[PDB]
Amino acid sequence: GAVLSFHNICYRVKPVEKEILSNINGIMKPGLNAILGPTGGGKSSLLDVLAARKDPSGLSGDVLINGAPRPANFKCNSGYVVQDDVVMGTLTVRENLQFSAALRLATTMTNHEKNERINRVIQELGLDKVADSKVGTQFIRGVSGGERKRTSIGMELITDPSILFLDEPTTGLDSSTANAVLLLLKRMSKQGRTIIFSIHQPRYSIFKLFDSLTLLASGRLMFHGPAQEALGYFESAGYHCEAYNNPADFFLDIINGDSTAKPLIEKLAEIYVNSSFYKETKAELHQLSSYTTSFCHQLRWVSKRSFKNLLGNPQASIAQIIVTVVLGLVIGAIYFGLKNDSTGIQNRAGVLFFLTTNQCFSSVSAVELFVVEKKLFIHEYISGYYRVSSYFLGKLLSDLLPMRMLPSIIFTCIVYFMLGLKPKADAFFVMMFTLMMVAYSASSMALAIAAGQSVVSVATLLMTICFVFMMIFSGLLVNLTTIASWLSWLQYFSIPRYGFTALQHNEFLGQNFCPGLNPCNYATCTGEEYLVKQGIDLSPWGLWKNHVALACMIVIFLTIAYLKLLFLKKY
Amino acid sequence: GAVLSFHNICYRVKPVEKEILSNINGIMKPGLNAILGPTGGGKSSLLDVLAARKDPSGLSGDVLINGAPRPANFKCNSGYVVQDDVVMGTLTVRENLQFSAALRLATTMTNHEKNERINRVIQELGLDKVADSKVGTQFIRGVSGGERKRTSIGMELITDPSILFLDEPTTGLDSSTANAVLLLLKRMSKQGRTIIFSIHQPRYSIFKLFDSLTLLASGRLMFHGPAQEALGYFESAGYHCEAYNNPADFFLDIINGDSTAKPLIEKLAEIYVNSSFYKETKAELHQLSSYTTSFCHQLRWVSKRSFKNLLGNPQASIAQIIVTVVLGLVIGAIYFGLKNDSTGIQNRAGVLFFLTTNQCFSSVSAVELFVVEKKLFIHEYISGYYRVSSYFLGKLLSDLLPMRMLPSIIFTCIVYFMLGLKPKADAFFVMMFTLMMVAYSASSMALAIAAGQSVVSVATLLMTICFVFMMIFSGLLVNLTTIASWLSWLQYFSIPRYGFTALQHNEFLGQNFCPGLNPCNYATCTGEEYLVKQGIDLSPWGLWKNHVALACMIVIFLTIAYLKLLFLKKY
Ligand SMILES: COc1cc2c(cc1OC)CN(CCc1ccc(NC(=O)c3cc(OC)c(OC)cc3NC(=O)c3cnc4ccccc4c3)cc1)CC2
Ligand SMILES: CCCCCCCCCCCC(=O)OC[C@H](COP(=O)(O)OCC[N+](C)(C)C)OC(=O)CCCCCCCCCCC
Ligand SMILES: CCCCCCCCCCCC(=O)OC[C@H](COP(=O)(O)OCC[N+](C)(C)C)OC(=O)CCCCCCCCCCC
Ligand SMILES: Nc1ncnc2c1ncn2[C@@H]1O[C@H](COP(=O)(O)OP(=O)(O)OP(=O)(O)O)[C@@H](O)[C@H]1O
Ligand SMILES: Nc1ncnc2c1ncn2[C@@H]1O[C@H](COP(=O)(O)OP(=O)(O)OP(=O)(O)O)[C@@H](O)[C@H]1O
Ligand SMILES: CC(C)CCC[C@@H](C)[C@H]1CC[C@H]2[C@@H]3CC=C4C[C@@H](O)CC[C@]4(C)[C@H]3CC[C@]12C
Numbered sequence A, B: 001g002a003v004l005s006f007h008n009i010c011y012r013v014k015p016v017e018k019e020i021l022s023n024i025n026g027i028m029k030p031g032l033n034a035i036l037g038p039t040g041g042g043k044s045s046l047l048d049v050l051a052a053r054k055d056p057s058g059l060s061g062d063v064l065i066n067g068a069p070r071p072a073n074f075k076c077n078s079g080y081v082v083q084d085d086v087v088m089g090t091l092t093v094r095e096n097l098q099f100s101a102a103l104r105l106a107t108t109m110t111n112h113e114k115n116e117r118i119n120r121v122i123q124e125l126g127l128d129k130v131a132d133s134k135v136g137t138q139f140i141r142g143v144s145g146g147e148r149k150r151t152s153i154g155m156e157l158i159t160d161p162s163i164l165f166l167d168e169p170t171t172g173l174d175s176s177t178a179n180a181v182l183l184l185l186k187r188m189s190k191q192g193r194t195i196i197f198s199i200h201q202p203r204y205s206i207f208k209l210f211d212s213l214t215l216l217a218s219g220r221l222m223f224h225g226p227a228q229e230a231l232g233y234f235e236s237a238g239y240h241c242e243a244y245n246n247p248a249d250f251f252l253d254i255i256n257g258d259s260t261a262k263p264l265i266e267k268l269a270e271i272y273v274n275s276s277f278y279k280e281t282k283a284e285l286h287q288l289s290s291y292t293t294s295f296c297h298q299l300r301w302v303s304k305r306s307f308k309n310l311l312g313n314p315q316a317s318i319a320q321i322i323v324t325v326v327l328g329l330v331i332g333a334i335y336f337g338l339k340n341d342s343t344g345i346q347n348r349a350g351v352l353f354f355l356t357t358n359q360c361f362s363s364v365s366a367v368e369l370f371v372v373e374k375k376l377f378i379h380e381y382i383s384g385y386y387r388v389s390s391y392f393l394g395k396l397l398s399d400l401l402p403m404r405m406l407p408s409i410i411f412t413c414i415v416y417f418m419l420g421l422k423p424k425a426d427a428f429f430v431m432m433f434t435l436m437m438v439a440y441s442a443s444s445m446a447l448a449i450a451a452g453q454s455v456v457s458v459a460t461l462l463m464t465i466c467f468v469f470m471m472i473f474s475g476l477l478v479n480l481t482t483i484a485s486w487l488s489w490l491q492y493f494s495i496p497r498y499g500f501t502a503l504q505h506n507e508f509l510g511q512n513f514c515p516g517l518n519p520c521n522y523a524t525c526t527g528e529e530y531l532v533k534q535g536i537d538l539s540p541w542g543l544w545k546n547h548v549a550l551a552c553m554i555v556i557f558l559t560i561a562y563l564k565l566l567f568l569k570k571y
């Protein structure tokens, strides 16, 4: 079995540094161990310290498994269940468990075997009725909080861990369900596994199951030792129960100073260090003194989950495609029959500008989903599911690449022929390629800004402002040849400028807009004159210059996003 | 005291109609009464039925207070505490209680007296340490879930009600805090008040406090009667406890079929109807067979809370003002020194278009706050705080009117003189007025769309799409004189068109853009020619036509919003 231990633990958090956890010493031998305490005592913090999910800076003690230091496979042979559930709402119960099994259990096992394990877990936790139902989504009403909580427990159990950490496994659950969960852990603990969990308001039947007990309060350790002997320890100092049927209440009332015999917290702790229990553990403590699956598998499974999540959030995929089609048709109707007249220049420039800005501003919606999933990404990376690289490339090849390509194609196919733009194939494909490139560049910039930011509103605001400032330098609202020199350099940071310039160069090159024709100066009859007055070049190199600039921006921004994820605080 | 009662209650929910609650009969005499049951049994639904927060369509029974039917002041002399807390995060604890006191307690009392009551409540609930701290916000980490829960309890207690309904008052609270809350209610119930609440996992000490008991399960009523006699009733059918220290577990285990003696639910219910308890209540039941404060006060307090909420969410007020200033300065730099040259027309039209669209699209951010507060509005209206009209006008005079006016002023003051637009005062004030009008019209349209919609994403998408379609008809991207007749009529539904046309008419009227000057046809030297080619009229009536159209749209859209709130399902 696994014999966890700790000694002289203290933790500090920040300027001013405060100690959430003061001196703590204990041994969590195999079996079933518990951590009772009042709210704010530090139950969740100690658990993370034991499971190495806290920044090692603050930690000021030694944690040992079976005497030897922490192995590098610790997170490959342990499980952690979070106080606040992190479960992808858009998926069903079974799908989430499948995801955990696939990326944590080794690939040597057959997929049928894994599904058999998954079914067994579901039956044990009583999730059969909602096995294939969806977890809650904003659009889709889903399972209750209790079923969601048990689902998080399931994902960790599937790994068949030798060590399991749980935080408030029984919250939002009625007594019957709570008892079933605890009995399962007890059965799971009579085989050599070590189970550590924090609980609120146990029943007497449950409390008898506890083998080892830990009692936190305001950081201090009031009592650690066998659960059955806890009553005797308190009785010696005073506090003869003889009132409460449930002992768990008897402990908490003492801590809150509601029972008969400087602060009561410090006073009680001083008693423990003088107890035999502290002496025994000090004697024992002093005496004692990688990823399962490869890159490709992680990529496939992450991309799959992203596909499903995207389809489950309609506003970002289905709605964008539908509005794309509607806009294409309306534009085709509004600009139908472009004429080489006085009005041709205006309408052509306007439509191209509209398409460009539409591609740029549509990227905001997708990345917002990248923002909301920061918490899940951190939790899964810490738990040891996947690497950063796999998550990044999967989200790209599932969300950014497929969906952002289509709007360009739809817009070109619908608009080009209805309006009557350049009737040559080269122009058609150039238009499609250019729109694709601006879309990808905007998405990459959005990712660079949004990656690592927790709040959706702030990221949305920042990206919107940046796109606005780009749009001012697109080449239509202002003439770039009239801008002062000390500000003109900014026009090279604008994506819409490159796309818009390319489209203009493609459309205006061989057109005359004065129908019947002593040249009339101050008049732009020919398209080339308009291009010149707007600053654009006439060589073939201008178009391709814009395109290569877009590609370089894509690469730069995506790389920045990867680095922002890499140097993030995953603790 | 207050003697509530019910008889033959059944409720139906929807097509297919299902009965959440089957036959239910009971009397909730003064004192302390409880509703235990497993999750999903129907505890929250019955409570709403008793407190008249459910649609009366489904209800199929009679509810009586003191024998007489439900008075119209029922919600003026009752309190309801929600299972999921509804507390404005951006405010402190004390501020929320002040809001409840001001609008529910009569104005005859002095404000100092109310604050004295508020202090007493806080001391009783143990919220003194966090009395003036802020409740949780996304930006501001706030009080724990337990303190938030007790705060919701406080707001109802301040009214000093003769009848109080609570739903899971002890959830997220440790035993010590839970016991304190229950003891307070017990003390509050020995004076004539009637208290009804639903609870999970009581302690034996608490359960002895219960005077009357109700036991729901899968809709059916398994037991109603005195709490002390509940054990005897079950013992007669079998189920001699002699195992469990806490009786509350003994009841729930039976319902879940985990104890010794068609489904167990139906089987148990059949026993109750044959019990003496059912006979007694049937004998008794068969035997038995406005706003405190005026309009202005509600308006003032709603507007005040809205001010605070707006300031607490920086992204909507502070950020919008800052970006407004930054955009003004950047625009002033980009377009500095507008010249009566070939480029003057383009830059002028572009800047005016940018300002107009900025005013239109900035309205999305504010209304989103109107969306998120739908739940709170429904809860408060049902509880009897305020009317619909007061809420509407308060949110207007607090959020829409003050904040949307400033950006226009800032933009005009910064931009007008730096660029060098028409150097006459009339044009300056016309520009300011026009921008104000488009801002208000867009906000009104946003409210009309967003009011009554629960999801933020959908409303944001809809308003954004509508503004896009308006923007196509602004007069720049397309020439309105070239649009086909069967679609041209749409141009009269566009707000940016009216604002943009007014600004163009103000700026271009007396300008010549050909510097040195056989007239050169196909050339727009004079501004009037440009206006004509864009379809605009030259009379003074065009400008004012646009303005009056905006005003009419404002009135229409705001009225629609009020009606949408009025005919909403507040149940
Ligand atoms: C988790 O819950 C959620 C929370 C939230 C959201 C979604 C959620 O759920 C996931 C999304 N919330 C977005 C709120 C929002 C959206 C937009 C703006 N503001 C502009 O967009 C704009 C501003 C200008 O000045 C400030 C401006 O100046 C000129 C031109 C602007 N836009 C254009 O010009 C333009 C042009 N073509 C377009 C074509 C297609 C689509 C958009 C186009 C836009 C401001 C706020 C924020 C919170
Ligand atoms: C002027 C009109 C045309 C030019 C428009 C300029 C847009 C520039 C877009 C590329 C910048 C970029 O993408 O920056 C990318 C950076 C990269 O993160 P980081 O630097 O490593 O931050 C450190 C992060 N750590 C500490 C975790 C490592 O993200 C950010 O900084 C986030 C905020 C960006 C705000 C940008 C607002 C720009 C307003 C400009 C007002 C004049
Ligand atoms: C074409 C370019 C220029 C013209 C642009 C047209 C914009 C019209 C704006 C005013 C309409 C309005 O504000 O409608 C206001 C209505 C009012 O609610 P209700 O009718 O009572 O719904 C019943 C609600 N109950 C049942 C509770 C009473 O809100 C809505 O319907 C909500 C959805 C509106 C979607 C509008 C999308 C428009 C897309 C047009 C694609 C051609
Ligand atoms: N990163 C952090 N920054 C600042 N304070 C923290 C941080 N982490 C924990 N704390 C503080 O430590 C104290 C204990 O928080 P903790 O998360 O341990 O609560 P808990 O013991 O899990 O109780 P419960 O989860 O039941 O509320 C709190 O006062 C909290 O503010
Ligand atoms: N509007 C509704 N539409 C469909 N079903 C409903 C509706 N309201 C309630 N129900 C159903 O009634 C049953 C009881 O739900 P209820 O809200 O009463 O739970 P509860 O008794 O409050 O239990 P808890 O709140 O502890 O989960 C549930 O199965 C729920 O799906
Ligand atoms: C039908 C046409 C004319 C409507 C104009 C386009 C806009 C207003 C429509 C087109 C497609 C629509 C979306 C279609 C599907 C969904 C998924 C649903 O679960 C919520 C609403 C939502 C997100 C719709 C919102 C409104 C929407 C974006």
Ligand SMILES: CC(C)CCC[C@@H](C)[C@H]1CC[C@H]2[C@@H]3CC=C4C[C@@H](O)CC[C@]4(C)[C@H]3CC[C@]12C
Residues within 6 Å of the ligand: A492, A493, A545, A548, A549, A552, A553, A556, A557
């Ligand atoms: C991290 C971010 C800010 C990186 C920004 C890099 C951008 C500004 C770089 C990437 C590639 C660059 C372009 C590469 C090629 C050319 C062609 C040349 O004849 C003019 C400059 C121009 C058009 C460059 C302008 C600056 C440019 C677009």
Ligand SMILES: CC(C)CCC[C@@H](C)[C@H]1CC[C@H]2[C@@H]3CC=C4C[C@@H](O)CC[C@]4(C)[C@H]3CC[C@]12C
Residues within 6 Å of the ligand: A458, A461, A462, A465, B139, B314, B315, B318, B319, B320, B322, B323, B326
């Ligand atoms: C300083 C200038 C150049 C920045 C450009 C303007 C944008 C990027 C800045 C200007 C004002 C800024 C806001 C100022 C204050 C707040 C409140 C804070 O609790 C969260 C960030 C937030 C919401 C900022 C977000 C970024 C913001 C909107």
Ligand SMILES: CC(C)CCC[C@@H](C)[C@H]1CC[C@H]2[C@@H]3CC=C4C[C@@H](O)CC[C@]4(C)[C@H]3CC[C@]12C
Residues within 6 Å of the ligand: B492, B493, B545, B548, B549, B552, B553, B556, B557
């Ligand atoms: C509920 C919503 C859709 C109501 C929409 C009403 C709009 C379209 C109405 C309100 C006031 C109306 C305007 C009132 C006055 C004039 C001046 C006239 O010489 C031309 C029509 C014009 C410009 C009207 C166009 C239509 C108009 C703008």
